[PDB]
């Protein structure tokens, strides 16, 4: 049942064709569903009435078939516009949109042809093996508040480091990866730690 | 049930994932046929506190499939031949 | 006025000149018995998908 | 009258002048989107004919029209449940908020579920539910309103306690001011601005959430 | 007579099913939009303008509604803007200096560099500027000192 979305469309179209062909077997209130039987059994004054009943029944069936065919065409056009958007944004580029190109942080994508369809292989990055750390918004040093340029302050219990947010890579808190704004009196939860200077 | 009367399924007090949807929160599964109020997911209580963070130490490269229909079978019907032959 | 239904007791108090009752969708859901002047609700007989 | 598009606002353009904001407003806005309809099913034979056998015998001369209409209504009915699954069931973990609501001054009581209500809805969701008022059958939805509210509560707990991390993998806990600072950096404003003016931002957020509840309670 | 009633009621039922399918397509499009907003505004922060409210989008909250969803979009709106005199680059020691992330502003006598969406003036140093070329090429370059820590 992996390919059920394409098979659903194929089954709906084949079932609509089978129903439209099957509707010719109905007489729609006439004496027979066969036109040759009516034309060989009856005079044209009453065969005109019987053929008229068959014509209005078959025309109603054909208009119904065209109506759901247009509705399914609108649905397939919307799905194809979505597929073209996914081809433009997931295959031809890297997308920041969450869950547009798979579950997780999207890295890249591969297109594959399918019968009346497309299959996107979304290669994504999933974080794993997370670990607790004690964190602080800022570091107080020399009466100044230090904030990370791109990372986050973490502590393993005794020592303070700065790391990138999506992967644990501890580094020494220096002036090169922090920036100074204001004193320590304003930021709630600021902690005392040294800031190394190269 | 709120969907109607269900005959032939043993109602249980346990909650599982939905296998066969009945409706109004009722689902059916085979294990005999049982009917139950379904469960959305496992509860995961996030260990929130005001000074603790969770940092990933590893990663998984995950490839997932997405199937999207593009076109249908191009069908044409001769209206005069279909109605009249 | 003919039909098929379950005739139960009704809490709708008719005015004395009124005999039948209709909802928004013009279906007879209340009626007065002519023998004894009491009001009966006409629930439709149960139908449903199997 | 001939209408007016808007007030004219002539921007004071020159080749060496810029306008820099010195303050900000935390603005909360509502967006209402329909998800599903009422699942209606019509018994075609009972609608056309009722209990008349002669009517159904004449109706069988027209073929499988009733099968087509019942199949289309069944497809609509399952499409509504598919829509509700696609909108609300995007998480397989039911996250819960901690019992202590210490989020650095941020108040979420108007959007978190109320324990005193038996429906386990938020006050905003309770107000939203208060403000919305012959062969035909109405099929009940697969997800009831309390389970949809449970899904929204799980999404709220995930986005409060973990930020955007629960939407991309395992839920990684993070303090809410730090998460807000990350969001500030996403829109290109430095973390220090958030930390220095955190009490003001929390007060503006609480005032905007209260104005949302008042505006929903005061607009028909 | 029953045939006339049958064709009238069948035409009515087919009409009802036709607008029900059209409304189902409309509701499906709205629900796909709602799922996109739930994925991109609630489960993440969106850079798309006006997709998750008016202003710079910060975060969003989902709320259940009868047959619907209500998104509370929390956004950042700039306010209390102030005029400043600006320049594309700073000329110092025969070199052109450009801001790494901010913008050069002047309150009338002194030049600073600030972030673009909030006024926070800082001293123009070598740590928040980068050097590219001389002063002869950039149109509108002004003379100001660049501090060295
Ligand atoms: C936190 O991390 C730091 C740095 O990795 C650890 O400090 C080192 O610990 C090892 C093991 O005892 C010593 O050999 C090193 O000399 C330490 N380095 C310094 C600079 O002191 C620290 O032990 C870790 N703390 C915990 C609780 O895990
Ligand atoms: C972090 O460092 C600051 C400054 O060194 C400490 O503030 C001092 O605290 C003592 C006692 O609490 C006072 O007598 C001083 O007047 C304070 N100085 C200043 C400049 O505020 C602060 O207590 C330290 N915090 C921790 C947790 O160690
Ligand atoms: C981070 O620490 C918290 C609390 O110290 C851990 O949360 C506990 O995990 C255990 C094991 O599953 C549960 O039995 C407790 O109920 C949890 N407590 C709370 C308050 O949720 C958490 O597991 C730690 N994270 C990691 C990655 O080790
Ligand atoms: C990160 O995860 C990978 C697996 O995704 C780990 O790689 C496995 O390591 C074990 C023990 O070292 C081996 O037996 C497996 O064969 C490895 N698998 C693969 C696919 O190489 C890796 O060790 C983890 N790293 C850390 C630091 O936890
Ligand atoms: C920045 O300066 C310009 C021009 O000095 C100001 O624009 C004028 O504003 C006044 C007050 O509304 C108007 O009467 C003038 O017509 C405006 N002039 C032009 C050319 O538009 C502008 O208001 C200043 N910005 C701020 C924030 O003070
Ligand atoms: C930025 O705007 C906020 C309001 O959005 C200002 O806060 C108000 O300040 C006045 C006077 O100080 C007080 O009377 C109000 O009670 C404050 N409102 C709130 C919600 O705190 C703030 O002062 C402005 N800051 C600057 C620098 O202009
Ligand atoms: C968070 O917001 C709620 C609602 O605005 C606050 O609850 C109010 O508390 C005051 C004083 O206790 C009462 O007079 C109101 O009636 C309460 N409102 C409601 C709707 O119950 C609450 O105090 C705020 N703070 C916290 C920490 O929850
Ligand atoms: C532009 O900003 C600078 C820096 O804030 C101002 O310079 C300071 O002005 C105050 C007020 O007279 C003095 O006390 C300081 O000593 C000045 N600092 C320096 C380094 O000179 C300057 O006045 C501002 N200009 C205008 C027109 O507002
Ligand atoms: C900015 O500084 C440059 C260099 O100090 C100035 O350029 C000099 O201008 C004088 C007179 O215009 C000439 O005699 C020199 O030969 C120029 N030197 C160079 C290296 O170009 C420039 O005029 C200054 N601009 C302003 C507005 O003060
Ligand atoms: C965090 O909570 C503890 C109490 O659990 C409190 O002592 C501390 O001041 C809080 N820190 C911040 C930054 O809110
Ligand atoms: C019919 O008779 C019964 C008792 O025989 C009486 O109670 C009832 O009122 C009568 N109906 C009318 C319309 O008077
Ligand atoms: C800006 O315009 C003024 C005239 O209004 C002109 O003197 C100056 O050179 C212009 N600067 C730039 C960078 O175009």
From Swiss-Prot, chain B:
The cytoplasmic Cys-rich domain is palmitoylated. Palmitoylated spike proteins drive the formation of localized ordered cholesterol and sphingo-lipid-rich lipid nanodomains in the early Golgi, where viral budding occurs. Main component of the anti-COVID vaccine Chadox1/AZD1222/AstraZeneca; in which the human tPA leader sequence is added in N-terminus to enhance protein secretion. Disulfide bonds join 18-27. It is found in: Virion membrane; Host endoplasmic reticulum-Golgi intermediate compartment membrane; Host cell membrane. It comes from the Viruses. Glycans are attached at residues 13, 50, 58. Variant D614G has become the most prevalent circulating sequence in the global pandemic since April 2020. The mutation is associated with higher viral loads produced in cell culture and animal models. It would not change pathogenicity nor neutralization properties vs vaccination. May be prevalent because the mutation increases virus transmission in human population. Belongs to the betacoronaviruses spike protein family. Contains sequence and structural motifs very similar to those of a bacterial superantigen and can directly bind and activate T-cell receptors. Activation of a broad T-cell repertoire may be involved in the hyperinflammatory syndrome in acute COVID disease. The KxHxx motif seems to function as an ER retrieval and binds COPI in vitro. This is Spike glycoprotein. The chain holds residues 645 to 744 of 1273 of the full protein.
């Amino acid at each position: 049942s992996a390919l059920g979305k394409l098979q659903d469309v194929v089954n709906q179209n084949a079932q609509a064709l089978n129903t439209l062909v099957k509707q010719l077997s109905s007489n729609f209130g006439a004496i027979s569903s066969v036109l040759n039987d009516i034309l060989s059994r009856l005079d044209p004054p009453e065969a005109e009435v019987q053929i008229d009943r068959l014509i209005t029944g078959r025309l109603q069936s054909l208009q119904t078939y065209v109506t759901q065919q247009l509705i399914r065409a609108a649905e397939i056009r919307a799905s194809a516009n979505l597929a073209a958007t996914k081809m433009s944004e997931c295959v031809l580029g890297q997308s920041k949109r969450v869950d547009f190109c798979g579950k997780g942080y999207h890295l890249m994508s591969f297109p594959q042809s399918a019968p009346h369809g497309v299959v996107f292989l979304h290669v994504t990055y999933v974080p794993a093996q997370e670990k607790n750390f004690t964190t602080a918004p800022a570091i107080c040093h020399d009466g100044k508040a230090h904030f990370p340029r791109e990372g986050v302050f973490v502590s393993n219990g005794t020592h303070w480091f700065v790391t990138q947010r999506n992967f644990y890579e501890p580094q020494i808190i220096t002036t090169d990866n922090t920036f100074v704004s204001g004193n320590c009196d304003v930021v709630i939860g600021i902690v005392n730690n040294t800031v190394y200077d190269p | 049930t709120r969907a109607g009367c269900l005959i032939g399924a043993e109602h249980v007090n346990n909650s599982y994932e939905c296998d066969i949807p009945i409706g109004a929160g009722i689902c059916a599964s085979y294990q005999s046929i049982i009917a139950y109020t379904m469960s959305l997911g496992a509860e995961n209580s996030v260990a929130y506190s005001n000074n603790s963070i969770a940092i990933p130490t590893n990663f998984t490269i995950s490839v997932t499939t997405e199937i999207l229909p593009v076109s249908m079978t191009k069908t044409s019907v001769d209206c005069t031949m279909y109605i009249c032959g | 006025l003919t039909g098929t239904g379950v005739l139960t007791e009704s809490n709708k108090k008719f005015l004395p000149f009124q005999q039948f009752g209709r909802d928004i969708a013009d279906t007879t859901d209340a009626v007065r018995d002519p023998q004894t002047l009491e009001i009966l609700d006409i629930t439709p007989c149960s139908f449903g998908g199997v | 009258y001939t209408m007016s598009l808007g007030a004219e606002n002539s921007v004071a353009y020159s080749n060496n002048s810029i306008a820099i904001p010195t303050n900000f407003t935390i603005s909360v806005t509502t967006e209402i989107l329909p998800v599903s309809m009422t699942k209606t099913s019509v018994d075609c034979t009972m609608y056309i004919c009722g209990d008349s056998t002669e009517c159904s015998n004449l109706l069988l001369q027209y073929g499988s029209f009733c099968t087509q209409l019942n199949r289309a209504l069944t497809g609509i009915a399952v499409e509504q449940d598919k829509n509700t699954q696609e909108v609300f069931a995007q998480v397989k973990q039911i996250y819960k908020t901690p019992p202590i609501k210490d989020f650095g001054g941020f108040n979420f009581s108007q959007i978190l579920p109320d324990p005193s209500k038996p429906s386990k809805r938020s006050p905003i969701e309770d107000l939203l539910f208060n403000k919305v008022t012959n062969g035909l059958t109405v099929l009940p939805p697969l997800l009831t309103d309390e389970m949809i509210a449970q899904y929204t509560s799980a999404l709220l707990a995930g986005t409060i306690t973990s930020g955007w991390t629960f939407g991309a993998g395992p839920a990684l806990q993070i303090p809410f001011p730090m998460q807000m600072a990350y969001r500030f950096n996403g829109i290109g404003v430095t973390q220090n601005v958030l930390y220095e003016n955190q009490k003001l931002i929390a007060n503006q957020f609480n005032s905007a959430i209260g104005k949302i509840q008042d505006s929903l309670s005061s607009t028909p």
